Symmetry: C3
């Protein structure tokens, strides 16, 4: 079956456990991050990946992220292209804190799945619809 | 056709009307909810469902939700897996209010569609990409 | 390959036709938009589109949108059904400003892709799951 190659920041990153096929996959904070109310921090997830050809990954918060950490994801959903596959192309969670909050290294703060890229399209200008 | 089994919380919930196939499907607040500026409320949607095998649902705000209700969805997009199919597995909309607001029972406050879960993937750790 | 008809607000709008290979496609502010901290504005994108039959479009912010402009998208992810294909069906980015900001005419502000609508489903009410 088609594979994703994963490289981790260092040996202290908890490896993504064996997955239940089809499920979205959780991602972990790579270090402790403190964020003050109304402030923004790009949280490292200590992974870089080579996605299957023609695929992209979508990243959103876990259901309990707001409840547990009082952050929102500022891009709503991160889109990661197949091309973002290099040796230092690490993934981040863009968190805005709605209250004072502490995120612990290892905390499962967002989740991802892969999806085929959209079919090739051609956009054609018309004067009226 | 693929069947979605749906259970309503009680007799007073307005039933999901006959759908136009393909279109996202609107969901309604199960109760009146007051939310003060800068506070958070889980809004009951009054429904639990068994989705098609190999699928998941995605839930987002309706276009008019902010204008009408002054709230954002704190998880960005809700993911509901096929396995969330229990008699007690009700759906909620996690609302953060950017202003004082009152959501009324019946209000179509978000929408959902089903989508096939991601294919078989094999994560392989590598030293370098 | 799949055709999308595009109509622009006026001749000053930046045309976005190029050979596509499945990447998301960037949309741009149709005019200057100034938003104050804790205020909301619909940002015009200066485009109306006829999507391929059976398809919908999804819109999200760009990765750098928050960093550069300090706005979030209030609906999280915009959904644009194939049915929004009329001559005045212009596209908007619903922007909530977390700090004072200035979006300039021509600025890339968000990104879209298309996706096949969800297949036909039959919703069936049950007394219990
Ligand atoms: Cl582009
Ligand atoms: Mg505030
Ligand atoms: Na850890
Ligand atoms: Na009602
Ligand atoms: Na960007």
């Amino acid at each position: 079956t088609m594979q994703i190659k994963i490289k981790y920041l260092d040996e202290t990153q908890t490896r993504i456990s064996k997955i239940e096929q089809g499920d979205w996959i959780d991602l972990r904070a790579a270090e402790d991050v403190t964020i003050k109310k109304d402030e923004f921090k790009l949280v490292p997830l200590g992974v870089a990946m080579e996605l299957p050809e023609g695929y992209e990954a979508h990243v959103v918060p876990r259901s309990s992220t707001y409840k547990n950490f009082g952050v929102i994801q500022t891009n709503s959903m991160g889109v990661i292209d197949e091309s973002y596959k290099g040796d230092n192309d690490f993934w981040f969670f863009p968190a805005y804190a709605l209250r004072d909050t502490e995120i612990k290294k290892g905390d499962r703060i967002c989740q991802f799945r892969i999806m085929k890229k959209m079919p090739a399209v051609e956009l054609v200008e018309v004067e009226h619809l």
